[model samples]
Target: AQYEDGKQYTTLEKPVAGAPQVLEFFSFFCPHCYQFEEVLHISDNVKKKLPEGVKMTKYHVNFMGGDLGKDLTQAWAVAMALGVEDKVTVPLFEGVQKTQTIRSASDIRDVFINAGIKGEEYDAAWNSFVVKSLVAQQEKAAADVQLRGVPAMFVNGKYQLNPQGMDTSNMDVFVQQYADTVKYLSEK
Candidate 1:
């Protein structure tokens, strides 16, 4: 999990409010990434259970989804701005995996619309400076890290988990390891 000393800490791909920076580095279509989605949910929920001020972010690794269907990185930014990330994440995975019904940009827009997020909201988010910044940030982070694979965790801008890469089936184990490392890093 060691990162080089003096290596720049990559800024978050998404903004984390009121907490030390922690990021899940992943690609949507990587099976390991998909498997770790539940852990991401539970970890965020665990942050809520804490006394407060522990936030998390996601760094979408673009290596896979660009080939699988359409990339949904922009959609993540929009969902976050609309305050509907949880509402979108699971359904997004399902949509990409189970149904070809909503695989492209317009289709992704429809997913948000059907989920009670307004068209105007999506429109604004899709074009907002904040969302565009997030997309740029993700690109920057990927360039900064010497990452070899998806589904890794980065801590406090200093270390990474799953350094050797991981198989999708081993994701649950990695999740536990990630949580343990995060807790220790948080000094909780």
Candidate 2:
């Protein structure tokens, strides 16, 4: 999708303070999000290219609205809180999408444990007040942003883009466009 300034991304009520924030709204259950992770190599490549004053965050969308969804959301939030999301995110997504085995808290934690998370650290992150508060804040942000779908990006918390919604199959073009859009918004 070619970004035409205001048409490609909606402006927010205010810019994120301090730095440009690139926020991703996604879900573990969404296959398209899985594709985005893989095809874009989001964790490794896109994040590395971010400008110095920009920050990127992932917020799990709670639109699924069931026990399974809540469990996955909590899992992600805890991983993020523990500062271990980079280690567990891909595996967690793979476990859920491929094996359909990560259905609960224990299942999700198993992925982390296998990835080298200690029991005490896991418990601390899972039960932390910060994790709970962040999850709550994420829920509110989702609703406040009027998020409509998965694999969406909100730049500087003021502009939103849905890669899955864009009428394109070319990954190269999509990635370039996404980067260009963020760069444009970060300067404003």
Candidate 3:
């Protein structure tokens, strides 16, 4: 299950002892990232393979929607703060990518409503310090990585996963390889 560092991943100057860290950088507006969840099930499949005490943390990139990027990132942070990611992430993705229902920041509230989150709860979290801090952290983390694109993963907060040379034609193996690499990097 071991993989080469430079081939499968590249080392970074800073390493996070955030043990077995798996950080995913993505944007809801990006079609490829949407596919990362919906079509290929990369997110779900990989999460399924994660062992105990290991977790995948997602960070929303802010370079896609121009000025709307910050608002979108804040909406994602709000979803996380509400503890409804399971109920809201997909709808939020559909709201933007599939249905095109969310055209502006204010429209994001409807996704929460349809996902069973109370308006008061959503309202409170929309501007809460936790959500605001989450947004800021996401921005800084992406900037810290000098992020080049969406749907990227950084294992151990230092080794950046490079999917270019993988045999993606077989998705089952592809997910296994990706997940196994995560496990190995976690131990390393």
Candidate 4:
């Protein structure tokens, strides 16, 4: 597969740490990101194709920087810090984009509460300095990449995979393209 410039993806100034770092830059408010979950139903097959020791990181981009974006960014940092990302990630996305259940920070806290987190613990984690710092770091990362949009995937921090010419409506094919892209890059 030929990876085109400007259309397919761009190269990074520096490569990410480790052998291979697969980063998914997304935002809760991005419709395309939501579609990746709701419509495409991104599966585990892509992840399953990763070679051992390859690290996959999800970077929540602060593209909007509004109340909702900041709140969701904080929620992401808090969930990651508290080690409840697995429990809260999908639900939070669904809540905001699909069900419209989470509109405010308190609503996010409620989701945490529903996920078995104590109110006090939630407050501590939500307002913790660590969470704030991590959010700052994530924002810096977004800026570092000069990120323009969401649902963007980067491999080894050097190559960005493009889905423009692919049939995005077909999740299997779309995902396999990414998988093949990763495989081709990893062999390098």
The best candidate by lDDT is 3
After TM-score superposition, the amount by which residue 73's alpha carbon in candidate 4 deviates from its true location, in angstroms, is 0.4
Which of 2 and 3 is ahead in lDDT? 3
Local distance difference test, candidate 3: 0.79
- Quickly count the clashes in candidate 3: 0
lDDT of 2 by residue, 40-123 (tens): 765445666667865677888777736878877877888888788778878978888988888777888889899999988988
Cα miss at 129, model 4 (Å)?
1.8
Q: What's the best-to-worst order under TM-score? A: 3, 4, 2, 1
- Cα-lDDT of candidate 4: 0.75
Candidate 4 weakest ten by summed lDDT: 11-20
**Superposed model 4: Cα runs more than 4 Å off:** 1-8, 13-20, 39-43
The alpha-carbon root-mean-square deviation between model 2 and the true structure, to one decimal in Å, is 2.8
For candidate 4, report its TM-score. Answer: 0.86
Tens-digit lDDT track of model 3 for 1-188: 34786877778877665433788988888988887877777777777777788777887888897766677889889877777778877887888888888887767888888888888988899979999888988887787778879888887778887777578788778777877676677677
Among all candidates shown, the one with the greatest TM-score: 3
Residue pairs in clash, model 1: none
Task: Kindly report which residue pairs in candidate 3 clash with one another.
Answer: none
Candidate 3, residue 153: lDDT: 89
What tens digits encode model 4's per-residue C-alpha lDDT throughout 49-155?
87888767776876664788888888889888888877887788888888998878888888888899899988988888999898987787677667898887777
